[PDB]
């Protein structure tokens, strides 16, 4: 099946297009091509600085009669500098305005950490520490719930939450909406077995981000492992007459995850969608899972002292 059922009765496409690091000058075409070749889920965020240009593409394809709004599944995320209850609606509305939409299909708390409100996405003190805000997970969640009640978003969820942070929300007496999704880094070097088991057992759908290992992440080092160039994964791909990227995208799909590979390269956008015509074997799945090294690429040292930093916990 190409979609997975969420807790609001809506269906979410299991394959979406990522947009982090898709430059504004290049992302409109990426999204147009993606829609043309069958993508219906686009993963966005205010912090990606390109929601206007994503919105332009969506608008263009709506006007061309290529898709209708109901067929699209548009995700965005509340940035860390907007966790204060009084800032959440405006942040969501800014995203809606930029995307030229009147609702989101899913809106996520981007990270559990609140940062000092202000213009800078990563406010630092003079010694390089992120400056936190006096906000907490439960109050931010309550503000997210209001967005559903007001019709701005159809579902809400979380991202980069560890299991204890998810538990905090789940256990709130007076909870109005359970998180529908937890979006987390997941690939063969960070397989997330425990957090995936936890979320799936709690009826929360997991989305795998950086499924190709985010080789374009701005802090990558030459000595860092590289999934796309891993000769072992290349061998699995060759056996299936597929590319390594296609294997890396199919992998989470077979774990009942949603997956959101990013590209701005039209050939790759098309390639990455051609993952519904083959199956990884039981041995392939076992082999890929065996490559786990707990090698997390997506974190930021300057955030490690934040009270709500998610990655001190085992999972
Ligand atoms: N919630 C969060 O905190 C969070 C964090 C990270 C990511 N995400 C989401 O997840 C998405 C995906 O993760 P990501 O952007 O970190 O990285 P990714 O999808 O793992 O990798 C993207 C990189 O792979 C390249 N690529 C794509 N398809 C390829 C192919 N078929 N062959 C070879 N190279 C290929 C891209 O190049 P080109 O684009 O130049 O083609 C880009 O450099 C993000 O864009 C974002 O939407 C969310
Ligand atoms: C845009 C962006 N910038 C940075 C620097 C990171 C790494 C990050 N690591 C962390 C982290 F450990 C925290 F506790 C809190 C954070 F906000 C970040 S952001 C990821 C992304 C992509 C995205 O967020 O979707």
Swiss-Prot record:
The gene is AKR1B1. InterPro entries: AKR, Aldo/ket_reductase_CS, NADP_OxRdtase_dom, NADP_OxRdtase_dom_sf. It is found in: Cytoplasm. One of its GO terms (molecular function) is retinal dehydrogenase activity. Belongs to the aldo/keto reductase family. The record marks 77 as: Lowers pKa of active site Tyr. Catalyzes the NADPH-dependent reduction of a wide variety of carbonyl-containing compounds to their corresponding alcohols. Displays enzymatic activity towards endogenous metabolites such as aromatic and aliphatic aldehydes, ketones, monosacharides, bile acids and xenobiotics substrates. Key enzyme in the polyol pathway, catalyzes reduction of glucose to sorbitol during hyperglycemia. Reduces steroids and their derivatives and prostaglandins. Displays low enzymatic activity toward all-trans-retinal, 9-cis-retinal, and 13-cis-retinal. Highly expressed in embryonic epithelial cells (EUE) in response to osmotic stress. The active site is at residue 48. It comes from Homo sapiens. This is Aldo-keto reductase family 1 member B1. Its main location: cytoplasm.
């Amino acid at each position: 099946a190409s979609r997975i059922l969420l807790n609001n009765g809506a269906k979410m496409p299991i394959l979406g297009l990522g947009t982090w690091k898709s430059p504004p000058g290049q992302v409109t075409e990426a999204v147009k091509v993606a829609i043309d070749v069958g993508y219906r889920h686009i993963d966005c965020a205010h912090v990606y600085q390109n929601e206007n240009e994503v919105g332009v593409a969506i608008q263009e394809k709506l006007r061309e009669q290529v898709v209708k709004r109901e067929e699209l599944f548009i995700v965005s995320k509340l940035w860390c500098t907007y966790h204060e209850k009084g800032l959440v609606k405006g942040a969501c509305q800014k995203t809606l305005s930029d995307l030229k939409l009147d609702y989101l299909d899913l809106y996520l708390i981007h990270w559990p950490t609140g940062f000092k409100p202000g213009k800078e996405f990563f406010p630092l003190d003079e010694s390089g520490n992120v400056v936190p805000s006096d906000t907490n997970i439960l109050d931010t969640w309550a503000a997210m719930e209001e967005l559903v009640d007001e019709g701005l978003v159809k579902a809400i969820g979380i991202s980069n939450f560890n299991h204890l942070q998810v538990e905090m929300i789940l256990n709130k007496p007076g909870l109005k909406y359970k998180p529908a999704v937890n979006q987390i880094e997941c690939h063969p070097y960070l397989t997330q077995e425990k957090l995936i088991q936890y979320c799936q057992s709690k009826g929360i759908v997991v989305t795998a981000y950086s499924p190709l290992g985010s080789p374009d992440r701005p802090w990558a080092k030459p000595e860092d492992p590289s999934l796309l160039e891993d000769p072992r994964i290349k061998a699995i791909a060759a056996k299936h007459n597929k590319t390594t990227a296609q294997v890396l995208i199919r992998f989470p799909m077979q774990r009942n995850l949603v997956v959101i590979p990013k590209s701005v390269t039209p050939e790759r956008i098309a390639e990455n969608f051609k993952v519904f015509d083959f199956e990884l074997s039981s041995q392939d799945m076992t082999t890929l899972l065996s490559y786990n090294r707990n090698w997390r690429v997506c974190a930021l040292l300057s955030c490690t002292s934040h009270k709500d930093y998610p990655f001190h916990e085992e999972f």
